[PDB]
Amino acid sequence: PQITLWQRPLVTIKIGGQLKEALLDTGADDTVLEEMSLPGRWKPKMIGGIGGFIKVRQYDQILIEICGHKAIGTVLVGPTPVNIIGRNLLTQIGCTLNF
Amino acid sequence: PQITLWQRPLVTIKIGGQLKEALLDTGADDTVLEEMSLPGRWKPKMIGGIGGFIKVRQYDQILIEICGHKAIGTVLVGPTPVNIIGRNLLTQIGCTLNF
Ligand SMILES: *[C]C(*)(*)(*)(*)([C]*)C(*)(*)(*)(C(*)(*)(*)(=O(*)*)N(*)(*)(*)C(*)(*)(*)(*)([C](*)[C@]1(*)=C(*)(*)(*)C(*)=[C@](*)(*)C(*)(*)(*)(*)(*)(*)=C1(*)(*)*)C(*)(*)(O*)C(*)(*)(*)C(*)(*)(*)([C](*)C1(*)(*)(*)=C(*)(*)(*)(*)(*)(*)C(*)=C(*)[C@@](*)(*)=C1*)C1(*)(*)(*)=N(*)(*)(*)C(*)=C(*)(*)(C(*)(*)(*)(=O(*)*)C(*)(*)(*)(*)([C])[C]*)[N@]1(*)*)N(*)(*)(*)(*)C(*)(*)(O[C]C1=[C][C]=[C][C]=[C]1)=O*
Numbered sequence: 001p002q003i004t005l006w007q008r009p010l011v012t013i014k015i016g017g018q019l020k021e022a023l024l025d026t027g028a029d030d031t032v033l034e035e036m037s038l039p040g041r042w043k044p045k046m047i048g049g050i051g052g053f054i055k056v057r058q059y060d061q062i063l064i065e066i067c068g069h070k071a072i073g074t075v076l077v078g079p080t081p082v083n084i085i086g087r088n089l090l091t092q093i094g095c096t097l098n099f
Numbered sequence: 100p101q102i103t104l105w106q107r108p109l110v111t112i113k114i115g116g117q118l119k120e121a122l123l124d125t126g127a128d129d130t131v132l133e134e135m136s137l138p139g140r141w142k143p144k145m146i147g148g149i150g151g152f153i154k155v156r157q158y159d160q161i162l163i164e165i166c167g168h169k170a171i172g173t174v175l176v177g178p179t180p181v182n183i184i185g186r187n188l189l190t191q192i193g194c195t196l197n198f
Pocket residue numbers: 023025026027028029030031032047048049050081082084086124126127128129130131146147148149179180181183185
């Protein structure tokens with residue numbers, strides 16, 4: 001799909017048996033989702049953005065269905081205001097930026 | 100151009116007689132540039148990112164060359180880690196995400 005940007009690029013994701021809308025974020029190296037029940041081990045990892053650093057739950061080889069497109073990756077879980085789909089998943093769904 | 104996301108979407112911009120590399124960002128509503136040598140009146144404005152909140156100075160009516168494509172708008176200057184190009188300027192240069 002061709003998504004224009006007059007509105008925040010929000011898409012629907014299905015993760016861990018649940019539904020959440022997420023922002024397609026070309027400015028995020030990583031995918032970070034707001035706190036949710038997700039299964040198995042993880043690792044502490046801190047990530048940085050505007051405003052500062054937050055501590056996150058590092059999850060890998062997690063299946064996410066992005067706008068009904070499946071993929072598997074590192075998903076970080078934590079104190080983020082918006083669910084963010086970062087470039088580590090954007091290239092999986094073959095998403096490009098165009099102008 | 101058409102940018103695939105396997106690496107950060109950095110692009111060259113020219114603002115206020117100077118040259119910088121900035122990141123095209125679909126998750127940024129606004130454009131926030133590092134502390135720079137930019138002139139006019141500006142108003143305090145504050146923003147939220149994943150780590151929290153910075154105070155920035157807002158300049159409106161600013162001209163920017165993003166890939167030889169000049170656009171005009173609001174530019175927020177302050178303590179950002181990288182130069183960010185938000186959706187307020189991205190829509191102006193015809194930017195769309197595709198997948
Ligand atoms: C993975 C994520 C933590 C990412 C990040 O925060 N990215 C920012 C832009 C950025 C900031 C600092 C450095 C580099 C890029 C942005 O994409 C995130 C959004 C998240 C968001 C979206 C919607 C609502 C609320 C939050 C964002 N932050 C601020 C906005 C705004 O719209 C403001 C203008 C109101 N939107 N970090 C990352 O790597 C960090 C890094 C690593 C190595 C060197 C330098 C930086 O990609």
